[PDB]
Amino acid sequence: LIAQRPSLTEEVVDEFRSRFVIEPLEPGFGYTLGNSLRRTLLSSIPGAAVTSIRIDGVLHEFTTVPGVKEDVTDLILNIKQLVVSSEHDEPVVMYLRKQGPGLVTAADIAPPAGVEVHNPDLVLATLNGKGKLEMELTVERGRGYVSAVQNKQVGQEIGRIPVDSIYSPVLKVTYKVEATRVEQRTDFDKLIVDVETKQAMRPRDAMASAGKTLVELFGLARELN
Amino acid sequence: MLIAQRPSLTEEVVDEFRSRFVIEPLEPGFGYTLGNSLRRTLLSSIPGAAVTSIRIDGVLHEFTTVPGVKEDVTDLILNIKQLVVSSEHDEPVVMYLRKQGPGLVTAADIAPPAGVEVHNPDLVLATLNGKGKLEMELTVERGRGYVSAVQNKQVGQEIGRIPVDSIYSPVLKVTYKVEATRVEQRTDFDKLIVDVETKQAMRPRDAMASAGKTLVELFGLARELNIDAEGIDMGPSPTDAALAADLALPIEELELTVRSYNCLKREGIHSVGELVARSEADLLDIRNFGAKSIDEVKAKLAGMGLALKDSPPGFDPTA
Amino acid sequence: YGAAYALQELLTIKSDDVTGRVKVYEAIVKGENIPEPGIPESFKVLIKEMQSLCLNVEVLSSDGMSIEMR
Amino acid sequence: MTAAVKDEISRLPVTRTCCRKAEVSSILRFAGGLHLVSGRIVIEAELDTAMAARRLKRDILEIFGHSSELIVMAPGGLRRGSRFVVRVVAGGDQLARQTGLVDGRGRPIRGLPPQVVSGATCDAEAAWRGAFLAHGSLTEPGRSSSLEVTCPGPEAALALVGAARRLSIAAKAREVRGVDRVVVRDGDAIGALLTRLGAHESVLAWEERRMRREVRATANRLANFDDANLRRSARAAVAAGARVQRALEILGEEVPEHLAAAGRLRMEHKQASLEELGALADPPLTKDAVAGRIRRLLAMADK
Amino acid sequence: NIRVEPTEEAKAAM
Amino acid sequence: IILSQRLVQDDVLSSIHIEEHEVDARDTKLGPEEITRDIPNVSEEVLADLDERGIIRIGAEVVAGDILVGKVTPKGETELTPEERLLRAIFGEKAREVRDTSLKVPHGEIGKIIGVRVFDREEGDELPPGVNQLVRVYVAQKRKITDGDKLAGRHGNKGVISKILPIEDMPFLEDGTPVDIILNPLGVPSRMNPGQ
Amino acid sequence: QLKLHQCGLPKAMALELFKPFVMKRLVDLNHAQNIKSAKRMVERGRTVVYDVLEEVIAEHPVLLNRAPTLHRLGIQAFEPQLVEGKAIQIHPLVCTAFNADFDGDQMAVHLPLSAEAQAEARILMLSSNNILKPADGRPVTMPTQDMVLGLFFLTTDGELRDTKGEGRAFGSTAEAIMAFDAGELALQSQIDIRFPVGTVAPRGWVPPVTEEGEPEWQQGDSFRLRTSLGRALFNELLPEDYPFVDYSVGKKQLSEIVNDLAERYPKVIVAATLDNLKAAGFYWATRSG
Amino acid sequence: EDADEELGWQERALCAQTDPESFFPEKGGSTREAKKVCLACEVRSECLEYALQNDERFGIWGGLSERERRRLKKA
Amino acid sequence: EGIINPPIDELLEATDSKYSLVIYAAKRARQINAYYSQLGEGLLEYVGPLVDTHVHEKPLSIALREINAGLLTSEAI
Numbered sequence A: 001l002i003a004q005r006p007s008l009t010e011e012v013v014d015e016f017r018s019r020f021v022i023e024p025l026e027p028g029f030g031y032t033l034g035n036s037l038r039r040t041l042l043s044s045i046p047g048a049a050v051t052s053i054r055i056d057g058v059l060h061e062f063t064t065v066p067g068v069k070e071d072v073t074d075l076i077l078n079i080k081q082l083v084v085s086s087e088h089d090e091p092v093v094m095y096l097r098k099q100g101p102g103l104v105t106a107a108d109i110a111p112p113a114g115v116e117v118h119n120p121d122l123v124l125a126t127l128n129g130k131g132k133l134e135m136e137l138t139v140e141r142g143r144g145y146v147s148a149v150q151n152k153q154v155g156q157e158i159g160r161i162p163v164d165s166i167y168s169p170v171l172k173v174t175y176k177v178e179a180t181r182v183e184q185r186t187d188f189d190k191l192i193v194d195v196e197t198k199q200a201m202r203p204r205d206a207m208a209s210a211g212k213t214l215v216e217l218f219g220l221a222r223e224l225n
Numbered sequence B: 001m002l003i004a005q006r007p008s009l010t011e012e013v014v015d016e017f018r019s020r021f022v023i024e025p026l027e028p029g030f031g032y033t034l035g036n037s038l039r040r041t042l043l044s045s046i047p048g049a050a051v052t053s054i055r056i057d058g059v060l061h062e063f064t065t066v067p068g069v070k071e072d073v074t075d076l077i078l079n080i081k082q083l084v085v086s087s088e089h090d091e092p093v094v095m096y097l098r099k100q101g102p103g104l105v106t107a108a109d110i111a112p113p114a115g116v117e118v119h120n121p122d123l124v125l126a127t128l129n130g131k132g133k134l135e136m137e138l139t140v141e142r143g144r145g146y147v148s149a150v151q152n153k154q155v156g157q158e159i160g161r162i163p164v165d166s167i168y169s170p171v172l173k174v175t176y177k178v179e180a181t182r183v184e185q186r187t188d189f190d191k192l193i194v195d196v197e198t199k200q201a202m203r204p205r206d207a208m209a210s211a212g213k214t215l216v217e218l219f220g221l222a223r224e225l226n227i228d229a230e231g232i233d234m235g236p237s238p239t240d241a242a243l244a245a246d247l248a249l250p251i252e253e254l255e256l257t258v259r260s261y262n263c264l265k266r267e268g269i270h271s272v273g274e275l276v277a278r279s280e281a282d283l284l285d286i287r288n289f290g291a292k293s294i295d296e297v298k299a300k301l302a303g304m305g306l307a308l309k310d311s312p313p314g315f316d317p318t319a
Numbered sequence C: 001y002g003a004a005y006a007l008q009e010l011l012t013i014k015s016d017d018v019t020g021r022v023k024v025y026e027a028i029v030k031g032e033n034i035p036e037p038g039i040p041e042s043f044k045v046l047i048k049e050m051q052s053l054c055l056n057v058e059v060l061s062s063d064g065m066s067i068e069m070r
Numbered sequence D: 001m002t003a004a005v006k007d008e009i010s011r012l013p014v015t016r017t018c019c020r021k022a023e024v025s026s027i028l029r030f031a032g033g034l035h036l037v038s039g040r041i042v043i044e045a046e047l048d049t050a051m052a053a054r055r056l057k058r059d060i061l062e063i064f065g066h067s068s069e070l071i072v073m074a075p076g077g078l079r080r081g082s083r084f085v086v087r088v089v090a091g092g093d094q095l096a097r098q099t100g101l102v103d104g105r106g107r108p109i110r111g112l113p114p115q116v117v118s119g120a121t122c123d124a125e126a127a128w129r130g131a132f133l134a135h136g137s138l139t140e141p142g143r144s145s146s147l148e149v150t151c152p153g154p155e156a157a158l159a160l161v162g163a164a165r166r167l168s169i170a171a172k173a174r175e176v177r178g179v180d181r182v183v184v185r186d187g188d189a190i191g192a193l194l195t196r197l198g199a200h201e202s203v204l205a206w207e208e209r210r211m212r213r214e215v216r217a218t219a220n221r222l223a224n225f226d227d228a229n230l231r232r233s234a235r236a237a238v239a240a241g242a243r244v245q246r247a248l249e250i251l252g253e254e255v256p257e258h259l260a261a262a263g264r265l266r267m268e269h270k271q272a273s274l275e276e277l278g279a280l281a282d283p284p285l286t287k288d289a290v291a292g293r294i295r296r297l298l299a300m301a302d303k
Numbered sequence E: 001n002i003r004v005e006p007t008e009e010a011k012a013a014m
Numbered sequence F: 001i002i003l004s005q006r007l008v009q010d011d012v013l014s015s016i017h018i019e020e021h022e023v024d025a026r027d028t029k030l031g032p033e034e035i036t037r038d039i040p041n042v043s044e045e046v047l048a049d050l051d052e053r054g055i056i057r058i059g060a061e062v063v064a065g066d067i068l069v070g071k072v073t074p075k076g077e078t079e080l081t082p083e084e085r086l087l088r089a090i091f092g093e094k095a096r097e098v099r100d101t102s103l104k105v106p107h108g109e110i111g112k113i114i115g116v117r118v119f120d121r122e123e124g125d126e127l128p129p130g131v132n133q134l135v136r137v138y139v140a141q142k143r144k145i146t147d148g149d150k151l152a153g154r155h156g157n158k159g160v161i162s163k164i165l166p167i168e169d170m171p172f173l174e175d176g177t178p179v180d181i182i183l184n185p186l187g188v189p190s191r192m193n194p195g196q
Numbered sequence G: 001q002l003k004l005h006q007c008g009l010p011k012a013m014a015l016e017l018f019k020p021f022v023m024k025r026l027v028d029l030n031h032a033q034n035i036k037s038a039k040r041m042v043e044r045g046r047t048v049v050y051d052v053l054e055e056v057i058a059e060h061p062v063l064l065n066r067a068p069t070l071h072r073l074g075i076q077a078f079e080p081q082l083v084e085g086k087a088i089q090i091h092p093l094v095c096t097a098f099n100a101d102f103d104g105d106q107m108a109v110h111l112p113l114s115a116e117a118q119a120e121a122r123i124l125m126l127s128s129n130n131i132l133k134p135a136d137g138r139p140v141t142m143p144t145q146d147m148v149l150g151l152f153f154l155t156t157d158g159e160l161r162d163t164k165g166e167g168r169a170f171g172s173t174a175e176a177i178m179a180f181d182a183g184e185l186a187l188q189s190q191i192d193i194r195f196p197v198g199t200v201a202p203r204g205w206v207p208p209v210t211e212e213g214e215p216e217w218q219q220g221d222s223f224r225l226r227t228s229l230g231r232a233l234f235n236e237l238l239p240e241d242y243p244f245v246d247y248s249v250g251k252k253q254l255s256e257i258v259n260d261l262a263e264r265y266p267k268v269i270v271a272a273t274l275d276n277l278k279a280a281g282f283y284w285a286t287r288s289g
Numbered sequence H: 001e002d003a004d005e006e007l008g009w010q011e012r013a014l015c016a017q018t019d020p021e022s023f024f025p026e027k028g029g030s031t032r033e034a035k036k037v038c039l040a041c042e043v044r045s046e047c048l049e050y051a052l053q054n055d056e057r058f059g060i061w062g063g064l065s066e067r068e069r070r071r072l073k074k075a
Numbered sequence I: 001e002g003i004i005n006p007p008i009d010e011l012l013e014a015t016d017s018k019y020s021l022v023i024y025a026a027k028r029a030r031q032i033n034a035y036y037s038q039l040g041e042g043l044l045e046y047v048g049p050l051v052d053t054h055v056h057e058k059p060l061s062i063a064l065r066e067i068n069a070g071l072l073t074s075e076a077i
């Protein structure tokens, strides 16, 4: 019987990639913890995302703006990959305005205070000499994937276009267990969880949130006595 | 974020030592995140004590039969393995069984030393015929989970030692399943059912509590990375959520002696919370004091159970 | 299968019993017993065509008396 | 007094679904309430009757599909009532919405639900059954009687009056000190109504009582029916003397001089009025003194 | 061509 | 076939479908039919997305039962049953003598309005004889992949999606890459198409 | 996840099929004042309408049919339940009876109305009372694919497998499972397992351990057996009275077992055993490799 | 609530929960009861407007009798 | 629970075959439904149910439960 308790340490591979090493666990007990952490990370990590738009001269998705090279149904696919973070529990709004020829990168949006656009290099559209773009993007907070239909408000406007929302800052999570067989006359596991996030928060915060959620969930079983 | 629907855990009892717990309603998913974890923690993360090896007599390895006893070596080893014991010594402890003559040698004939106990004396270990003798030795020690005789084979060779599989974990069999449960709201809300079966020593509820505590510690290990990190908030903890109906109510009292209520109203007490704590000194020092008034603010004050000088919740008045 | 009532309702009060469809709808809406099926319209159309072919089709009761189907 | 009639009413078997829905709606509208909690709604119903609580519970569960609690904490709060409070927590919002208490996406409903009103006459009979079970009083201001039900507002009182009209009966709404009720003064109408509700044994007992008692000619008029009313208040003082004999069964607990003298004067001069009794005191004491003394004697002999 | 009716014993119980 | 939720998140298998609804105002014995938003007896809320000439607005979202084009057809003199006449007398709603035949979306249809094309016989359009006016309305909707939709490959391997699992609970490679589709191997050998 | 007597209807089809019943029910519960308002409420598709539908749909069988109807088992009565989608859900076992594949096939649903029709669809045409085939008498409601494979991989000999253990003695099947969870035992390795006093010894097994002065009984004899863990897990699916199988179970053996169960046991037990076999076969086919 | 729809001001009439016969007295009947009831109804203004628009000289609407409605309509 | 309750084997111990059981249960169900429909109006010969019921239970299920419990008898006319 071992009296040693498991301990966790962190290593940084990239600014948005970390390896968390947990050891020593009981034999045949690392895969379960790793998979539970992976499920929690990929499922229920809160974030912020765009939830609707409206353009100056557009009434529905299935049309095109004079002067831009993309349909209004491709701008939507381009702004779905728009990684943002928000601090206001209300539906914040930001404005995009561009005139003249050139590429409308994500760096051309004017976020208000408390919200950010974390990848100011995504290309949203390209305008010729006779085209101008003016639109407003609504930012909300949530978790998981919320479809456009669920984003429809009651009695909305004619020009409001709801959009699919992906409230998830975690990009790729994996794990691996090494059977250490450490020299204590016994065998034990060593779990290593590799976490990569999409440049919205560091993996440490994602792991902390997952741990908080799992602790809250298991507390109900703990207090059964 | 807020879960908006706190799950609940409910137990059912099938036998003396068999239970069936239900957790519901879990969010979509989450029936598999904490099902395999609970099962494995129950089956491999609870301390126990068990027999490690036995020394039947000065003569053995004649696996055909042990002289004097009806059964054979394998049946004897299985019967020993069924034994349930509890121990407190970290080091191995040796006890002896010295039944003699014809009859049925059972667990009650063992002579455990101090610090160890056998919880099922009625278990039958063998049958002796023809005035046979059975002078057996059992070594007991603590551990976790199931560890086989492999990993217990001793390089040092002793004539009579025979290692046996050790079942340390109190819980013997755990199964789980998940189902859909929601009708009012959207479907896909998970309900988790876990069937637990243990041995005579421990009840399923204790095993569930220990597993939950261990998992909570394990995941707090990771939550410590950044304490100021948002997660899924259950919100209304049942204890204080229920006790808010009587502990932090603005009304000091509803039914009580009018004299005492009037005296304490205009003296610096509005909500019962301000009075529950630091009661003795406040009632003593200031002009407002009473000898038998304690009976009206100590016993009858406990609308649903409460003593004074108790920490009150909601210290911020919701003015 | 040997299910006669299911077949009879599938052939009369769900397809052809003109006066039976409304009665069964009313019975369900008012929460009472479904009424007995009648005689389908297709049989009457067949008899009319056969009579139009100068054939003396007629239905007889227990005694040798015609019913005339209204 | 009334308890027997209410028991006869409640024990009666009711079959038609509309009548049961109407009775449940009426009982929930008179002697029940909504208690907003946690942003949702819970329904409570406090009944001062033996089994009508079971009747309401069963009717709710069967015709509406809900499960009740039936906590027997007394309604008065002093534990003396020993009367039953039935509660509905889970789904009580739907019970409130589909019983008629609250509808239209707005505040609760002041009077009876619109569905109980404008229904077959049997439905009005059910409405009276429920209303008379919730509250009620079968008073006898003299030899002829008068029903009474304290409705929770003028709208409910007027609705009950209208429902009575459909039963051919005569009803009168009334209000005093801001609390209002429905009164049917005529004794024959009282019997007619109490027959419709369902009670018959109680009807027979009331009919024999009033018929025998009322036939006491006193020339009507003032000073000839007024003296009859002085004698009727003297019979009320005879009931007070029965309370005094209840106090005697209790022994009165070794009462002091004043109350003993007052009780003795009341008993010996069983017909003398309070003023007349007071005139008999050695130090002439006013009607007020005897009034207070009888008040406090009744208070003491309450146990 | 049957006739269904509760037994005498069953009627009394209810 | 089992699918991943990613194929629904990223519109990998989503497609736009368009339908057209056509209605014409023609001539009748009791006078011509007209297209207008002055429908005889309709709660005003329905006539909210209709424009000046009674044709739904471009960009409006329709659901089953909605009105696309407002049309009124005359019916002439008729005799009402006693109950209907008594009810009308109660509520005093004078009959208009023209009923509604407006064009409505069929049952189980949704989508936005893409285009409205209207032809007038009095504007020189070559409408057939006895057709005063014609109008066509286009409704478009984007469909995502859902269970019941049929998928297939190039080797004659087809099947209907019977499940769409979350991304987390999908068999994932050693580096955390979930698989987007799971196919039964029992169908490969017996069908003799090892090409897949 | 369905049982042998259950089917899954999309809520649109269910609502359109049961319209009069739901109208009457929601008029009864005062969710509407009259049939006109109830009809409008159902047509507009409110929320409580589906809550009422979920309870008017209970214990009302529906006939499921697939054209062409080559034999009487092509029409079968199922108990419906609402599912979220636009496609029906069919238990995997009845497919063979319907000759139904899942590559675009369609089926039709009919609704019995009267008490006689419901009684016929409930007693005569029920799905779990039609195990055998009228043509020759062999079961058709039997595990067919990915279940035969699972129950075969489970109950088979370790010819070329990495059979580890092969000589260990276990005091119960729970201990064997605990040893298997750890990388110590194989699902097909031959081990000595002791069974409780409830199990029935294998058909044959005429000799117990040779004794003297005290015999063994056909039941209540705590007997050790040389068998694999997979065979014990398989036998934990059959009824409590069924003798131990202890041999490889392909499709012929499984067909014989199902025929014996149908002949010797009530219908409810047979349906429960079939569902147990279905679930276990799917699980172990997933874990088969 | 979840109704999400209103038919009009009729649904919010207090008199619906009260004796409908009290608003049409007979043979010398009184008017205090119905008039008192109307003064608490929220849609009283709408009821009076509807009564004036339809110009019906029977019953009492908006808390006014037929004679009061005539006098108001005179202007 | 559900449509498989009571079991067919137990029910068949009270009749001769499935065909007769169908008519037996159907007639009992019609009697129960008629009793419910006309319960409010004047009394009629219809009786039952003879067993504990639910809020809104199908009369056929109640009839089958009564048949299984042994509270009914079928004659020949």
Ligand code: SF4
Pocket: H012, H013, H014, H015, H016, H037, H038, H039, H041, H042, H043, H044, H045, H047, H048, H060, H061, H062, H063
């Ligand atoms: S004002 Fe009109 S709606 Fe209101 S209570 Fe009076 S009559 Fe009824």
Ligand SMILES: [Mg+2]
Pocket: G100, G101, G102, G103, G104, G105
């Ligand atoms: Mg096919």
Ligand SMILES: [Zn+2]
Pocket: D016, D017, D018, D019, D120, D122, D123, D126
């Ligand atoms: Zn009635």
